[PDB]
């Protein structure tokens, strides 16, 4: 998939030593035409029993269950997509679903209710089929989320900073500690450099992408 492209893009920026070569002109790497369409605005890790629930920035929700199936609820509050482990998709609604999906729909509704009532929406200030969560994992320092549109999002726990990587735009959005949201073209970070903080996070991102590539299926 496009993970290989993402890895190549990150190799290229990291190899350019963007924080170690003199005048850094990070602002000139910003490219508003690359702003992502979707990212994860909230998440709930209940994976010891059920799975990982999440909200996308369009107020849709989803769950990646521990059996590797997914349920997606569109922001209309009724339309549902069910995705099997193999990626096979079917459509239904909360109002009309097979009884076999009863338990999973109930769980989705609990996750949805929780993420409607609680937590801050990441990227809240910011305004193409709906992606689903292909896979995820967590380390001690971050949660890594891989969307079916090829995007990879990394949220760092301690300082609340976040990266949204898109291999189609070859771009990274960095959400900093003050929740400022800036989208950069990766090749322009090569061209113009960046601060050591972003540089360090892009090195970490490369390692996370290698982990995704080495743990497929």
């Amino acid at each position: 998939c496009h993970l290989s492209d993402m890895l190549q893009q990150l190799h290229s920026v990291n190899a350019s030593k963007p924080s170690e070569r003199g005048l850094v002109r990070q602002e000139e790497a910003e490219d508003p035409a690359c702003i992502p369409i979707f990212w994860v605005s909230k998440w709930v890790d209940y994976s010891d029993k059920y799975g990982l629930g999440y909200q996308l920035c369009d107020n849709s929700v989803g769950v990646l269950f521990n059996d590797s199936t997914r349920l997606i609820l569109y922001n209309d509050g009724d339309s549902l997509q069910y995705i099997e482990r193999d990626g096979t998709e079917s459509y239904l609604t909360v109002s009309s679903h097979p009884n076999s999906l009863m338990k999973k729909i109930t769980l989705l509704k609990y996750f949805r209710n929780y993420m409607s009532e609680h937590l801050l929406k990441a990227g809240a200030n910011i305004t193409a089929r709906l992606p689903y969560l292909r896979t995820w994992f967590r380390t001690r320092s971050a949660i890594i989320l891989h969307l079916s549109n090829g995007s990879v999002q990394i949220n760092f726990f301690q300082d609340h900073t976040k990266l949204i990587l898109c291999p189609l735009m070859a771009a990274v959005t960095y959400i900093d500690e003050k929740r400022d949201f800036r989208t950069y073209r990766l090749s322009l970070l090569e061209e113009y450099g960046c601060c050591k903080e972003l540089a360090s996070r892009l090195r970490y991102a490369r390692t996370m992408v290698d982990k995704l590539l080495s743990s497929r299926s």
Binding site: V44, D45, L119, N155, H160
Partner: peptide, 5 residues
């Protein structure tokens, strides 16, 4: 953490 901010 077990959920987001």
């Amino acid at each position: 953490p077990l959920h987001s901010t």
